[PDB]
Amino acid sequence: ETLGEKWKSRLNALGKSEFQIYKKSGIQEVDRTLAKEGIKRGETDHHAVSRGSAKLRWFVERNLVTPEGKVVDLGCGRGGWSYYCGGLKNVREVKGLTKGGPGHEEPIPMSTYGWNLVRLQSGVDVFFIPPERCDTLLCDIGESSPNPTVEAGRTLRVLNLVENWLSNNTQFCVKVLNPYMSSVIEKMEALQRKHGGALVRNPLSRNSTHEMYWVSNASGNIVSSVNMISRMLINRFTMRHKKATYEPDVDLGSGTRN
């Protein structure tokens, strides 16, 4: 048994209203009221389609991942990671792929800066299409379960997916939903040995998930990095100024790139 699983159990034991408070406790939020209000009205212009744009922003503006070349966005959902990549100096093709359909997030068409370089496909399942060439590989897949055993298999499927997609020097950002289970640790140590990078916690993540992202330009003992987060997440159960701090939302320009 791990320090993560302790966290998981305490989390699971929470009152409905107690969990809602834990979730936002001392996190970083993104200011989305107006951007969402604009989208509801048609505006295709300056708005990130989701808070993922801001979320990826954070890794990128710190050179943890430098999208370049042909970017594949596995599970692009609405499109927040892709449209944000679309505007990035070093970037040529953005290809975003996602399930969509009833009960899943569908890609929203946007005219943001570099939109013309972004193509997003709904109706695809990625675990069952063939790997393609790419320079930057992104992946935000991993559905949360109260049962950590579940999360570990979901997380395992994902890494096993990404491997098949990766070559040498590939820029990458992958959600590892449950990095604390011992099966996931094991896989990650391998993956790191073979590919580099470390796991990093994004301050925009809620306290109710123990997600960390495997990002390419970083280093660090996996085990230790997972633990300092389980510790962090446990410490936040007992918190005494539990407001969130807010960032203004990414503004993603408009119009076309050549």
Residues 6+ positions from 98 with CB-CB distance below 8 Å: 75, 76, 77, 104, 105, 107, 120, 121, 122, 124
Alpha-carbon distance 168 to 201, whole Å? Answer: 24
SS3 call for 170: coil
Min dist CB 155 to ligand SAH, Å, is 12
CB closer to ligand SAH out of 126 and 229: 126
Nearest approach in angstroms of CB 10 to ligand SAH is: 26
Task: Report d(CA 230, CA 94) in Å as an integer.
Answer: 34
Contact code string over 139-178 relative to ligand SAH, x by CB under 6 A:
-xx-------------------------------------
Please give the C-alpha separations between residue 59 and each of 98, 211, 229, in angstroms, as whole numbers: 22, 14, 17
Choice between 126 and 226, CB closer to ligand SAH: 126
d(CA 63, CA 26) in angstroms, rounded, equals 24
Q: Is 251 annotated as a binding residue?
A: no
Tell me, residue by residue from 219 to 248, as one string, x for binding to ligand SAH by CB under 6 A and - for no binding: ------------------------------
Stretch that binds ligand SAH, among 1-9, 57-65, 119-127, 210-218 (CB under 6 A): 119-127
- For ligand SAH, the binding residue among 18, 31, 37, 125 (CB under 6 A) is 125
Which position's Cβ is nearest ligand SAH? 52
- What is the rounded distance in angstroms from the CA atom of residue 200 to the CA atom of residue 71? 21
Q: For the chain, what percentages of helix, strand and coil (3-state, to nearest 5) are there?
A: 35, 15, 45
Residue closest to 62 by CA, chosen among 180, 221, 198: 198
Q: Binders of ligand SAH among 22-81, rule CB under 6 A?
A: 50, 52, 75-81
Is residue 31 marked as binding? no
What is the CA 64 to chain-centroid distance, rounded? 13
Q: If binding means CB under 6 A, how many residues of this protein chain bind ligand SAH?
A: 20
To 10 degrees, what angle do helices 182-195 and 222-235 make? Answer: 130
Binding residue ranges? 50, 80-81, 98-99, 125-126, 213
Catalog residues that contact ligand SAH under the rule CB under 6 A.
50, 52, 75-81, 97-99, 104-105, 124-127, 140-141
Annotated binding-site residue numbers for S-adenosyl-L-methionine? 50, 80-81, 98-99, 125-126, 213
